[PDB]
């Protein structure tokens, strides 16, 4: 099969700055009919791929002028003259000259931006969940950058350990931030056995850690 | 406009077969190749094969020749792919894609497993100071995927739907949150719409302050 080798694998770039992705095929993509069946695709998270460039250099309808493609033979480049926030995702080259058609491994384009401290929100377990026999206490860190943060739980001033799990969103296509959810899991009995639940948040944008809490 | 609309998610047992559909509109179905593509973390995007609906000509990737069969129904402008002798390595998202991959379907999630479907438990996340947040917890379901919207999709500003996370004990969970002006609390309608098609679980949960 024709191997499609993309570089780089990750592209970290600041808004308004140029960027480029290269693709190497193990066989020339020039077909006997004179065309070079090389395309570029973009896939955002949980969405289908979308074609951006075809036949090396032709732009699909609605694709911004900031995108150009070039190359010949085995070596091709996708160029973005200025990255906007909505360009984030995974870019793939793909060839349809040789059977089987093949794709590159993908290049993730992520965006750099200024530090943004998280807004923090705490949620107690719903009466519905408690009535159902278990308890989840949730802390939300919203619209922050960079992705790294620390979340610590306290229950009646007892610092917790080994009973929380965090999940992070993909980077936001408008403001390039992230959001994070932390779920503290206790049995219903352990939850009703205590009073004060608090989540303490440390982040590079906070001079001092931020605590949100509720009394059961 | 060109539209490629795929059939819904599937949970199937090892050794079984499944047939996925791709219903097309907006162009003359007979005059465009239709490709099928597999996406698996790990394996990336893989081309399965293609069919020309005008005469049924097919090209297969040798890797999938003993696994996949492509057919078309010209009368309904629909393309089909049957996958047989299924194993866990066949768990993936499958896409139909037209011509030189110029238009794509929305994908079909296939899970190959001996497990039964389990619908999610949907719980509100309600507040107990300019901005407030609310959400829903979508807990302990199997298999993927679930879809979540707010107010049937009419509310999108401030919405964050977190990725599904596979838990150590075999089930998935996710959450969706919305940040809103604190004034909107207790006065505006916030309904989280959860659909888990494999278990035929649809939930519309109104989220209110406690």
């Amino acid at each position: 099969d024709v191997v499609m080798t993309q570089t780089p694998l990750t592209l970290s770039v600041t808004i308004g700055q140029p960027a480029s992705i290269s693709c190497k095929s193990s066989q020339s993509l020039l077909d006997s009919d004179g065309k070079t069946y090389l395309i570029w695709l973009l896939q955002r998270p949980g969405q289908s791929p979308k074609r951006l460039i075809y036949l090396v250099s032709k732009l699909d309808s609605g694709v911004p002028d900031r995108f150009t493609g070039s190359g010949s033979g085995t070596d091709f480049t996708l160029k973005i003259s200025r990255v906007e926030a909505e360009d984030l995702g995974v870019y793939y080259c793909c060839q349809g000259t040789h059977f089987p058609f093949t794709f590159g491994v993908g290049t993730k384009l992520e965006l750099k931006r200024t530090v943004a401290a998280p807004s923090v929100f705490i949620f107690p377990p719903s009466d519905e969940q408690l009535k159902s026999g278990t308890a989840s206490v949730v802390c939300l860190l919203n619209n922050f950058y960079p992705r790294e943060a620390k979340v610590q739980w306290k229950v009646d001033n007892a610092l917790q350990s080994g009973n929380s799990q965090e999940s992070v969103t993909e980077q936001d296509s408008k403001d390039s931030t992230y959001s994070l959810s932390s779920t503290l899991t206790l049995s219903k009995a352990d939850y009703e056995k205590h009073k004060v639940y608090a989540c303490e948040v440390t982040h590079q944008g906070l001079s001092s850690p931020v605590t949100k809490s509720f009394n059961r | 406009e060109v539209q490629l609309q795929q059939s819904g998610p599937e949970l199937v047992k090892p050794g079984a077969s499944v047939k996925i559909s791709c219903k097309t509109s907006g162009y003359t179905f007979s005059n465009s190749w239709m490709n099928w593509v597999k996406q698996r973390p790990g394996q990336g995007l893989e081309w399965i094969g293609r069919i020309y609906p005008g005469d049924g000509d097919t090209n297969y990737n040798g890797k999938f020749k003993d696994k996949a069969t492509l057919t078309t129904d010209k009368s309904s402008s629909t393309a089909y792919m049957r996958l047989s002798s299924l194993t866990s390595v066949d768990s993936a998202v499958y896409f139909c894609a037209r011509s030189l991959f110029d238009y794509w379907g929305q994908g079909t999630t296939l899970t190959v497993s001996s497990a039964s479907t389990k619908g999610p438990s949907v719980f509100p996340l309600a507040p107990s100071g300019g901005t407030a947040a609310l959400g829903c917890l979508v807990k302990d379901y199997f298999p993927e995927p679930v879809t979540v919207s707010w107010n049937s999709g009419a509310l999108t500003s401030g919405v964050h739907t977190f990725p599904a996370v596979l838990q150590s004990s075999g089930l998935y969970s996710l959450s969706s949150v919305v940040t809103v002006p604190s004034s909107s609390l207790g006065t505006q309608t916030y309904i989280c719409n959860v659909n888990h098609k494999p278990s035929n679980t649809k939930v519309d949960k109104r989220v209110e302050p406690k």
Binding site: - | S32, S99, L100
Partner: peptide
């Protein structure tokens, strides 16, 4: 736009 002529790749015109 499509082309009834079958070609190696379709919808490139």
């Amino acid at each position: 736009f499509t082309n009834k002529l079958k070609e190696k790749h379709t919808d490139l015109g």
